[PDB]
Structure formats: structure tokens, C-alpha cells
């Protein structure tokens, strides 16, 4: 018989909090977890809004109902209790993200857009200068014009362009990043524009990979279904974080396993918490919290 809890929290930073949820959801012996926390500028949807779609499809499910949900963060969630449930997202797990970097498969992320192109061209050379092994993914969330797009290249040194793995979304439009990209020589990766409608997974010289981060696409299967489409194309597909608890961050650290086997995931993010909760990452020193002192809603 269906039994099930629904959670709620906030986690203080190093975003003040970040706010989410978590839902239980029972069968029997039988239990499964997933975390719903949709993303302030990125998710579409609220916390509050989440929340309430949330403890309606709960109480559904619980009445026998067979409804998936369609809201991305709450479907995400959702997905992972039941595949939990039902044993289908393995334990396994090597929990090593890429690590999140400033200045200093050797993999390693740093993200672009935040200060002027040619710094960040800057760095990047030095970089790639300093270590010669080292591969780079670089995040721009769409930050520049085609003009800041040729500054951002132009202090990169062109014999160290093969180690920028890709460079996610670039430019402003889809037309203009692939323009940077046969350009530059420097690969770059789709991530927003997976979530546009009409996306297609499509050949296209320049592009080598896509970012995929669950909590702003929808469920499970479909993460499943946007990795092989990936992977069928040739293309590497990374497992990113939307800034999860360490719970959430964990289940992304097995889907990464399980279907990106040969992709370290872009899981670098619990450090900017404060506690972890429920479930631990491997290797943190951040206190956890307990199930039991969470604000429970259903």
C-alpha cells in the first residue's frame, strides 16, 4: 500500500537560502526520495508554486492515481522517488565533480560573463598556460554580443583553444554561438536551449556537447531520453547542478553514473551551503541534517 511525506526547507548560503522541498514516497518496503527546488531565474516556476503542485500530485498519487507531473522541478523530484521506488537509478556512484575554479581527464569549470570579455580571456589563457593537462568547460549563460564573443577569444591563445571542452552558450542567439564556434575553433555546448521548444538534436559543426540539469528540465526520462540523444550524435552530455541540496546532488552524482558513465558531472556546488541534509556527499565536512527536524508538510 502507497503511503508518503512531503518536506520543506530552507538552506542558509555561504541566494540568502536556498528553498526546496523533498518528497518520501512509500510502497510497502519499498521507499524512494527526490527533491524539488526550482531555481530562482532559471526555473519558470516558484518555490511556492512548486510546493503547491507538489502536495496536490502527492495527495493524488496516494489516492492511485497514475498522473505524471509536468512542472519541470516537481516532475524532476518526483521521477527520482519513483525510480527509487522501483529500484531503476542504481546506487552506484563515484560522487567527484568537475571542480568549480576562479584563478590557479584533468576537468576543471569556470564561468564567464561576470566580468568584461577580455578578462575573461585573460584568465582563461593563464589557465591553460599554467596547466598544460588541464581541460576546460567554460559557462557564459548566454552572455555576450558576437563582439564580446571575438573579445572574449581574442587572449585566447589559439594552440590552447583544443582544451576549452566546450564553452556553454556563448552568445545571445543560437546562430551566433555557432558562428562563434566555427570561428574561434572553440567548442561550445548547448544548456537554455535544450529547454526552448522546437529544440532538435541536430549535427552541427562546433558543437561537441549539451549541459542538462534536471531540475530545469522535467523528469527523469526525459534527462534519459536528452543523454542518448546526445550520445547518439556523437556529443558528450553533462549532468549539471541547479544548486541542489545535497540530496538532489547525490541522485544527480548516480544519474551521471548510471547514464553518463564517462562524464564527470558539473556537481561542484554543495560548498556554497551551508548544512547538508538527509542524505551525505561522500567526503563532505558539512554538518547534516536529520529527516526529523525538517519542516514536515504531508
Aim: glycine content about 6%.
Amino acid at each position: 500500500m502507497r503511503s508518503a511525506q512531503v518536506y520543506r526547507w530552507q538552506i542558509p548560503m555561504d541566494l540568502k537560502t536556498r528553498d526546496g522541498l523533498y518528497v518520501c514516497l512509500r510502497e510497502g518496503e519499498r521507499e524512494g526520495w527526490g527533491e524539488i527546488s526550482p531555481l530562482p531565474g532559471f526555473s519558470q516556476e516558484t518555490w511556492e508554486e512548486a510546493q503547491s503542485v507538489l502536495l496536490a500530485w502527492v495527495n493524488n498519487w496516494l489516492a492511485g492515481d497514475c498522473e505524471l507531473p509536468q512542472m519541470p522541478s516537481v516532475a524532476f523530484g518526483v521521477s527520482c522517488a519513483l525510480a527509487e521506488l522501483t529500484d531503476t537509478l542504481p546506487q552506484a556512484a563515484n560522487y567527484r565533480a568537475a571542480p568549480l575554479c576562479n584563478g590557479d581527464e584533468k576537468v576543471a569549470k569556470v564561468k564567464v560573463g561576470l566580468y568584461e570579455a577580455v578578462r575573461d580571456g585573460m584568465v582563461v589563457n593563464l589557465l591553460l598556460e599554467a596547466i598544460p593537462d588541464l581541460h576546460l568547460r567554460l559557462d557564459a549563460n548566454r552572455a555576450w554580443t558576437p563582439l564580446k564573443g571575438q573579445q572574449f577569444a581574442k587572449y585566447v591563445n589559439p594552440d590552447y583553444r583544443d582544451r576549452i571542452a566546450f564553452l556553454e552558450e556563448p552568445c545571445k542567439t543560437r546562430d551566433d554561438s555557432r558562428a562563434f564556434a566555427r570561428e574561434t575553433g572553440i567548442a561550445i555546448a548547448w544548456d537554455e536551449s535544450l529547454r526552448e521548444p522546437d529544440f532538435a538534436f541536430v549535427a552541427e559543426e562546433g558543437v561537441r556537447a549539451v549541459v542538462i540539469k534536471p531540475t530545469l528540465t522535467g523528469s527523469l526520462e526525459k534527462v534519459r531520453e536528452q543523454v542518448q540523444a546526445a550520445h547518439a550524435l556523437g556529443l558528450t552530455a553533462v549532468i549539471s547542478s541547479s544548486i541542489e541540496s545535497s540530496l538532489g546532488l547525490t541522485q544527480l552524482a548516480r544519474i551521471a553514473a548510471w547514464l553518463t558513465p564517462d562524464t564527470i558531472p558539473g556537481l561542484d556546488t554543495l560548498d556554497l551551503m551551508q548544512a547538508q541534509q538527509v542524505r551525505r556527499w561522500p567526503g563532505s565536512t558539512l554538518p547534516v541534517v536529520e529527516v526529523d527536524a525538517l519542516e514536515r508538510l504531508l
